[PDB]
mmCIF file of C-alpha atoms in Angstrom:
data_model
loop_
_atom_site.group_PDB
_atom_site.id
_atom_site.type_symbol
_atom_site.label_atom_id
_atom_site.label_comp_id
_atom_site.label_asym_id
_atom_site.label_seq_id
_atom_site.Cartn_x
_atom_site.Cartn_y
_atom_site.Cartn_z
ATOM 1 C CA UNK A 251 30.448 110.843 69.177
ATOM 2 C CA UNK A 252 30.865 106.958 70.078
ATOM 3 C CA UNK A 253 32.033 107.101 73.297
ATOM 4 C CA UNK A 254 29.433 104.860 74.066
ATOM 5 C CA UNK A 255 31.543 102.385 75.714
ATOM 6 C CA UNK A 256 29.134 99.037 76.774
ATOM 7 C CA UNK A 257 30.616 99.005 80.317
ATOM 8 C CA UNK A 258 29.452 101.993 81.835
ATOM 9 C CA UNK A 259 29.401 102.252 85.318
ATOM 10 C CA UNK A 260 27.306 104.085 87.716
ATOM 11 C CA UNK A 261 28.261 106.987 90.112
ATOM 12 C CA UNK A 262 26.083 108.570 92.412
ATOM 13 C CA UNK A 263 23.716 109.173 89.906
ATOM 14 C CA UNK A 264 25.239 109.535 86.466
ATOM 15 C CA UNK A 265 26.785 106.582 83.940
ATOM 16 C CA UNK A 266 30.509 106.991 82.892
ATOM 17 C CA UNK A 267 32.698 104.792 80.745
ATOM 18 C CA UNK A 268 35.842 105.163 83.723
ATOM 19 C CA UNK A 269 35.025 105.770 87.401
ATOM 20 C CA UNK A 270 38.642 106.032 89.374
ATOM 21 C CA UNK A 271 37.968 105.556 93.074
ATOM 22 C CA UNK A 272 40.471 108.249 94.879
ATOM 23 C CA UNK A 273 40.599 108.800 98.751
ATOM 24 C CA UNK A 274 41.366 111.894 100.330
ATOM 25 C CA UNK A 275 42.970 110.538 103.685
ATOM 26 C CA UNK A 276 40.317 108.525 105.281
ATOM 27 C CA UNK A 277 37.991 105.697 104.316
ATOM 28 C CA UNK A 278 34.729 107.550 104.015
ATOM 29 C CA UNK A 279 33.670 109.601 102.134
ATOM 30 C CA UNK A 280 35.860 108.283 98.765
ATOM 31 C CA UNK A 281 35.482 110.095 95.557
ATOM 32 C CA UNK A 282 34.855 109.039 92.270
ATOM 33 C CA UNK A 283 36.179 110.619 88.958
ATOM 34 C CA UNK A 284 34.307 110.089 85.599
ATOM 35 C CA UNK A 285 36.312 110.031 82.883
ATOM 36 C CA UNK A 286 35.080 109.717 79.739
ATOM 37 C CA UNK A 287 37.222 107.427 76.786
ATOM 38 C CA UNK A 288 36.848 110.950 74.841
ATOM 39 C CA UNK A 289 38.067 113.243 76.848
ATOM 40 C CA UNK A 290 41.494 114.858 78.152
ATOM 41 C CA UNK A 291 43.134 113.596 81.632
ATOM 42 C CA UNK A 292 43.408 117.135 82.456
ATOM 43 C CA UNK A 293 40.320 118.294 81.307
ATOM 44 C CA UNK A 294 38.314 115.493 83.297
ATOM 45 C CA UNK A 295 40.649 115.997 86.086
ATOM 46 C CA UNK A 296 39.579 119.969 85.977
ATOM 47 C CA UNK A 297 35.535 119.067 85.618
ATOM 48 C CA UNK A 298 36.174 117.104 88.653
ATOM 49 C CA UNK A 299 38.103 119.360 90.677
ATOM 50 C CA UNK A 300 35.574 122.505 90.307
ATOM 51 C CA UNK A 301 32.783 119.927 90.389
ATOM 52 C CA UNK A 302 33.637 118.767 93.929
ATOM 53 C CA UNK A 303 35.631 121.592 94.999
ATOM 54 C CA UNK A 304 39.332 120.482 95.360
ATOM 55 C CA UNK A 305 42.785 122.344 95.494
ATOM 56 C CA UNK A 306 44.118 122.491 92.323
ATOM 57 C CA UNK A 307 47.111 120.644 93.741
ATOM 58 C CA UNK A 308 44.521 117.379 93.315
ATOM 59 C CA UNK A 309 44.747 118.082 89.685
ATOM 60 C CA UNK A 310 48.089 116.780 88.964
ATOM 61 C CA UNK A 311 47.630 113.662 91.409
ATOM 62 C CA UNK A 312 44.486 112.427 89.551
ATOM 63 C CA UNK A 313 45.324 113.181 86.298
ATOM 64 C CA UNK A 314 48.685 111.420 86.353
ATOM 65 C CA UNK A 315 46.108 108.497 86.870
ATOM 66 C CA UNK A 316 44.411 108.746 83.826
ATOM 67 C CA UNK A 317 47.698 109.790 81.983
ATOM 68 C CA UNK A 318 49.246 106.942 83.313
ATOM 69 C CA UNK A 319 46.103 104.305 81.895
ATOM 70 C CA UNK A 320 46.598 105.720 78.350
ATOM 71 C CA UNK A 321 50.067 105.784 78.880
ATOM 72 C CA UNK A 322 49.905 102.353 79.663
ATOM 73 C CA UNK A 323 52.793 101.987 82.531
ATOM 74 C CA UNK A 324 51.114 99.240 84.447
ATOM 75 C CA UNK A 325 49.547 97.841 81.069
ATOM 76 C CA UNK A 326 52.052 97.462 78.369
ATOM 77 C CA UNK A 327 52.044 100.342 76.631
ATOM 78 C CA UNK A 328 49.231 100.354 73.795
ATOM 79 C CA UNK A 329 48.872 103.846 72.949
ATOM 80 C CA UNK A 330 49.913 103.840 69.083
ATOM 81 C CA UNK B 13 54.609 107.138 113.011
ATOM 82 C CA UNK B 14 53.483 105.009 110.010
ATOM 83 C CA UNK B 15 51.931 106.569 107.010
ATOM 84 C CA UNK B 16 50.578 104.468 104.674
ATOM 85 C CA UNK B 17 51.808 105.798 100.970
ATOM 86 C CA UNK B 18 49.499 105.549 98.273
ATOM 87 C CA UNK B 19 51.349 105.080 94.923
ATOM 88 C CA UNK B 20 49.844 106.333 91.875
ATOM 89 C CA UNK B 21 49.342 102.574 90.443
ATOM 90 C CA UNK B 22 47.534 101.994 93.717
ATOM 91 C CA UNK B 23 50.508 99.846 95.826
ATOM 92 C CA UNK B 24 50.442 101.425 99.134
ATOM 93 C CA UNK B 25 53.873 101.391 100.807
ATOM 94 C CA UNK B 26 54.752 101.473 105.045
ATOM 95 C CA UNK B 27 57.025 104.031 105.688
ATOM 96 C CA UNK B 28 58.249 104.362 109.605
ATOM 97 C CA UNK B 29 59.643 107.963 110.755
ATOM 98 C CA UNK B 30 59.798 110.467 113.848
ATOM 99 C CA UNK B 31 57.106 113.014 113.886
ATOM 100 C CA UNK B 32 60.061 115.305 114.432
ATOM 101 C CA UNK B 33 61.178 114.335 111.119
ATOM 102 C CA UNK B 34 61.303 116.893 107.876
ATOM 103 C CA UNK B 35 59.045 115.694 104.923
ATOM 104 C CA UNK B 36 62.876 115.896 103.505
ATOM 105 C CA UNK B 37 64.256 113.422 105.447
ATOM 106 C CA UNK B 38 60.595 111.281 104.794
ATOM 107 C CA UNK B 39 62.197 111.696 101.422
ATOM 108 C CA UNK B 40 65.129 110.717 101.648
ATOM 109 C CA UNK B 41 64.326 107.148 103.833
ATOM 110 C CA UNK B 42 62.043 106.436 100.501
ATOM 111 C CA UNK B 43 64.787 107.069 98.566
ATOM 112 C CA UNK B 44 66.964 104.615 100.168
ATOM 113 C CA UNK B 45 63.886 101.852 100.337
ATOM 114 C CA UNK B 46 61.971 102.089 97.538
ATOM 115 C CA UNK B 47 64.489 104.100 95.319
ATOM 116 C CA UNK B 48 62.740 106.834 94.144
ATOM 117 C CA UNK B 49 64.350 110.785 94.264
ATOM 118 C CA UNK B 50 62.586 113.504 96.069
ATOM 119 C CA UNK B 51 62.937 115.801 93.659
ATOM 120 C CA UNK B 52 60.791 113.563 91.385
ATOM 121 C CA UNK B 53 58.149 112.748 94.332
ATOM 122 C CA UNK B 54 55.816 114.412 95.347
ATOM 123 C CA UNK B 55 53.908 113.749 98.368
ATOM 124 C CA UNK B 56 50.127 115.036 98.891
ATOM 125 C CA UNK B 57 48.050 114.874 101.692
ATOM 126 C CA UNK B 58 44.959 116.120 101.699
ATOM 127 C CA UNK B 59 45.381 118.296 98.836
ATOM 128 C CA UNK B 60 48.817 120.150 100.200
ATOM 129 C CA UNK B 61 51.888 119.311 98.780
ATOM 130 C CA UNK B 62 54.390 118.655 101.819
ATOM 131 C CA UNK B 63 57.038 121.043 101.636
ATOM 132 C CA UNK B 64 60.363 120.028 102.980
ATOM 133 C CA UNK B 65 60.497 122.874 105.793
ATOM 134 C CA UNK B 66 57.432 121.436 107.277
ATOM 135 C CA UNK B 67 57.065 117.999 109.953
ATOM 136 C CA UNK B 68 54.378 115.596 109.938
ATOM 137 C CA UNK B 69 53.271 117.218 113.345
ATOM 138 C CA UNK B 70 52.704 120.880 111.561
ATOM 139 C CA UNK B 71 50.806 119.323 108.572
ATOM 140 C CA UNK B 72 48.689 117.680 112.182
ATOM 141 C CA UNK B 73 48.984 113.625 110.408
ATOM 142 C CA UNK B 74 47.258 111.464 112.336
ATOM 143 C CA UNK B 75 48.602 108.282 112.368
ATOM 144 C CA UNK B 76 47.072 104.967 109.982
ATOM 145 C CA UNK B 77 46.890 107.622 107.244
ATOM 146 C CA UNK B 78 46.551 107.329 103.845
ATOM 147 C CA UNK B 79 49.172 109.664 101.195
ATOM 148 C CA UNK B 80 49.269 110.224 98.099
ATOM 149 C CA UNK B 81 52.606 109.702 96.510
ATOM 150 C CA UNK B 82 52.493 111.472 92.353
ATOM 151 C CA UNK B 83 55.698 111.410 90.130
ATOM 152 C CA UNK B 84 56.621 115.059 88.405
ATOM 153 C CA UNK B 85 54.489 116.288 85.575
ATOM 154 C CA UNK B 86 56.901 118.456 84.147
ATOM 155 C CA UNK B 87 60.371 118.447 84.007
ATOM 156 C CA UNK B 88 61.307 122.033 83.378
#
């Protein structure tokens, strides 16, 4: 427990430490998934995908996003 | 038509086809631009995967629309 992270961003109505903006096709409405620095890419991915109701299909495409930030492929790597 | 692909990092990419062309093909012309295999790709529009045997006109695409291009998870 010290995920508390001093840039915490507001969604909605709820503070998270990462809030990934993903589109569906158009511009409106976009989504927003909160993902926490303590928690698992597919495990945030899931909490997202029964929380707004998506295809598990979706699961995959945003949690290669958050794999891919702790992965660091467009940062440098960074992980060890 | 023109989709506009979506890359995972975010860099969205033109890519110009038929609408009588197989997501296969679609594939295949990213293959030859960008360089990346469509075994490895994996296109997703609003939440379907698009399979090969299917056109842009069964999947209804409008045009000026944003995809999702996602690399494999697994690789067997």
């Amino acid at each position: 427990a010290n995920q508390q992270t001093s840039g915490k961003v507001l969604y909605e109505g709820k503070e998270f430490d990462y809030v990934f903006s993903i589109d569906v096709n158009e511009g409106g409405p976009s989504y927003k998934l909160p993902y926490n620095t303590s928690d698992d890419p597919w495990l945030t991915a899931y909490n997202f995908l029964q929380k707004n109701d998506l295809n598990p299909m979706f699961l995959d495409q945003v949690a290669k996003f958050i794999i891919d930030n702790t992965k660091g492929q467009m940062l440098g790597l960074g992980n060890p | 038509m023109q989709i506009f692909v979506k890359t995972l990092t975010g860099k969205t990419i033109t890519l110009e086809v038929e609408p009588s062309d197989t997501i296969e093909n679609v594939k295949a012309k990213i293959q030859d631009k960008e360089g990346i295999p469509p075994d490895q790709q994996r296109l997703i529009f609003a939440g379907k995967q698009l399979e090969d045997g299917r056109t842009l006109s069964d999947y209804n695409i409008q045009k000026e629309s944003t995809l999702h291009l996602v690399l494999r998870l697994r690789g067997g």
